[PDB]
Symmetry: D2
Subunit: 122 residues, 4 copies
Amino acid sequence: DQAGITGTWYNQLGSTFIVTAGADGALTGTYESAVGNAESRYVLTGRYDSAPATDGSGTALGWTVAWKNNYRNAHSATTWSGQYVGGAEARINTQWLLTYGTTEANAWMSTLVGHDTFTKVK
Amino acid sequence: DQAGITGTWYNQLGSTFIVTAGADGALTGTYESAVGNAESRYVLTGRYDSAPATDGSGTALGWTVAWKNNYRNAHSATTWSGQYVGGAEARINTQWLLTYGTTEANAWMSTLVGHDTFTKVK
Amino acid sequence: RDQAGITGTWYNQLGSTFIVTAGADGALTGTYESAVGNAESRYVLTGRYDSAPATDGSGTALGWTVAWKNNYRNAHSATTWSGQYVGGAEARINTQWLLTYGTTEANAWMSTLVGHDTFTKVK
Amino acid sequence: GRDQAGITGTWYNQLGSTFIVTAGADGALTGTYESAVGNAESRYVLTGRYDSAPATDGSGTALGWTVAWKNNYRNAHSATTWSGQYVGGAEARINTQWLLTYGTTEANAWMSTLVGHDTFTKVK
Ligand SMILES: O=C(CCCC[C@@H]1SC[C@@H]2NC(=O)N[C@@H]21)NCCNCc1cc2c(cn1)OCCC2
Ligand SMILES: O=C(CCCC[C@@H]1SC[C@@H]2NC(=O)N[C@@H]21)NCCNCc1cc2c(cn1)OCCC2
Ligand SMILES: O=C(CCCC[C@@H]1SC[C@@H]2NC(=O)N[C@@H]21)NCCNCc1cc2c(cn1)OCCC2
Ligand SMILES: O=C(CCCC[C@@H]1SC[C@@H]2NC(=O)N[C@@H]21)NCCNCc1cc2c(cn1)OCCC2
Ligand SMILES: [Br-]
Ligand SMILES: [Br-]
Ligand SMILES: [Br-]
Ligand SMILES: [Br-]
Ligand SMILES: [Cl-]
Ligand SMILES: [Mn+2]
Ligand SMILES: [Mn+2]
Ligand SMILES: [Mn+2]
Ligand SMILES: [Mn+2]
C-alpha cells in the first residue's frame, strides 16, 4: 500500500494533495486548497494503517492541515478522516472537519463538516 | 502556544492524550484510549495554528491516530479537529471522525463522529 | 416556490428511495426506504424545508428525520439528513446525515455515524 | 409510547436555547425551537421522530428533529437537524450532534454545513 498512497492527489474541488507514506504509518507532505482562505501549499501531517486488511477493505488514514504558511494564516485547521481504495480507480475517500478559532461565545459555530474524494487524475 | 498545548491531557472518557508541540506548528505524541478496539499507546501527529488571532479566540488544531500498535490493529484512524482554549483552566474542545476500512458496499457505514473535550486534570 | 420541485420520488447513490411531499409553509412528510442497513420496507419521515429561499443562485435548505421503526422491524436508531435542494436541469438534493442508535451511557461515544447522500430523480 | 411522557416537555441546551416538544405514541416529534444564538429570534417549527419502542435494556432512545430557520420574523436560509438519544433516569438528558446547512451556491457547497453537539436537560 505504501506505493499507491504516496504521490499527488486532487479532490473534487481541484485541491492538490502531495503526500509521502512511510512504512511505519506516517503521512507527510503539502496541501494546496483550491478554495477558502488559502494560498499556496500548507504542511500536512498524518497517519495511516501500515498493515491493512487484504480482504478488500480500504486502508484507514487521516491527516491534518493547519492553515498557516508563509503567505496567510486562516486560524483554522482541517482533519480528513477516511480510507484509501486500491484498484485501477485508485481513490481516497474522506470526510473532513474544519475548525477555526472562536471566542467561547461563538464556539458553537466553530466547526464545518464535509467530504472530499481524491484521485491521482490531474 | 507550545507551552500551553504540550503536556498530558485527559478527555471525558478517561482517554489519555500525550502531545508535544513545536514552534513550527507541529504536533507529535501518543494517544491512549480508554474505550474502543484500542490497547496501550498509539502514535499521533497533527498541526496547530502557530500564531493565533489576537481577539482572544482559541487556537485551531487537529491530529490523527492510526489505530495500529505492536499489540492491536483496529484497521481504523481517528482525526480530531478543535481548538485550544487557554486560561486558568485550559481546555481542548474537539470533534472527531473515526473511519474504519470497509469494502465499497459498506462504505456508507464507515465513519463515526463524536466530540471530545480534553483537560489537564483527569 | 420549490414546493413542487422538492415533492416527488428521489433516489440516492445507495439505491434508497426517498418519497417526500413538501407542504405550503415548509413541512416535509413522506417515507424512506433504505437499500442498506437494518431496515425493511418504508419508514415514516418528517422534516422542514425553507419555503422562502434566497433567489441568488443558492440552494434551498432542508432536513428530515427517519426513526428506523415501522411494522416490520425496529433498529433502535434514527437518521437525520441536513442538506440543500438544488433546482434546475437535473435537480439534486445534497445531504450530510447523522445516524444515532440507542446505547448505554458508557457506549455513548460510539453512537453516531456520519455520511453524505446525494439524491436525484434517477436510478 | 415508552418515553412518550419523558421526552415530552420543555428542554434547554448548553447555549440557553429552548426546545419545546410533544411526542406521539407511535414516533412523531412536534413542537417549537427558540435558539439562543445565531440568526434567529422567537420560535421556529420543528418536527422529528423518535424510537417509540426502545430496548428497555440499557440503551438510550434514538431520536432526531429538524428546524428550518424561517418564521414570521426572520429567514436565515438554513436548517438544523439534531440526532441523538434520550437518556432517562434521575436526570433525563437529550444528547445530540447536529448538522446546520445553509443555502449556498454550487461553488460554495463545500462550506455549507456546520456540525456540533447540544446537550438538553429539563432544567432552565
Ligand atoms: O478557509 C479556510 C482555509 C481552508 C479551507 C479549505 C477546506 S479544507 C476542506 C475542504 N476541502 C478542500 O480541499 N478545501 C476545503 N479557513 C476559514 C474557515 N472559516 C473561518 C470563518 C470565520 C468566521 C465565519 C466563517 N468562517 O463567519 C462567522 C464569523 C467568523
Ligand atoms: O475502536 C477503534 C479505535 C479506538 C478509538 C476510540 C475513539 S477515538 C474517539 C473517541 N475519543 C477517545 O478517546 N476514544 C474514542 N476502531 C474500531 C472501530 N470500529 C470498527 C467497526 C467495524 C464494524 C462495526 C463497528 N465498528 O459494525 C459494523 C461491522 C464492522
Ligand atoms: O441500519 C440501521 C437502519 C438503516 C440505516 C440506513 C442509513 S441512513 C443513512 C444512509 N443513507 C441510506 O439511505 N441508508 C443509510 N441502523 C443501525 C443500527 N445499528 C446498531 C449497531 C450497534 C453496534 C454496532 C453497529 N450498529 O457496532 C458497534 C457496536 C454495536
Ligand atoms: O444561524 C442560523 C440559524 C440559527 C441556528 C442556531 C444553531 S442551531 C445548532 C446550534 N444549536 C443551537 O441551539 N443554536 C445553534 N443560520 C445561519 C446560516 N448560516 C449562513 C452563513 C453563510 C455564510 C457564512 C456563515 N453563515 O460564512 C460566510 C459566507 C457564507
Ligand atoms: Br473564512
Ligand atoms: Br468496533
Ligand atoms: Br446492524
Ligand atoms: Br450567520
Ligand atoms: Cl441580531
Ligand atoms: Mn454562520
Ligand atoms: Mn450499524
Ligand atoms: Mn465501531
Ligand atoms: Mn468558514
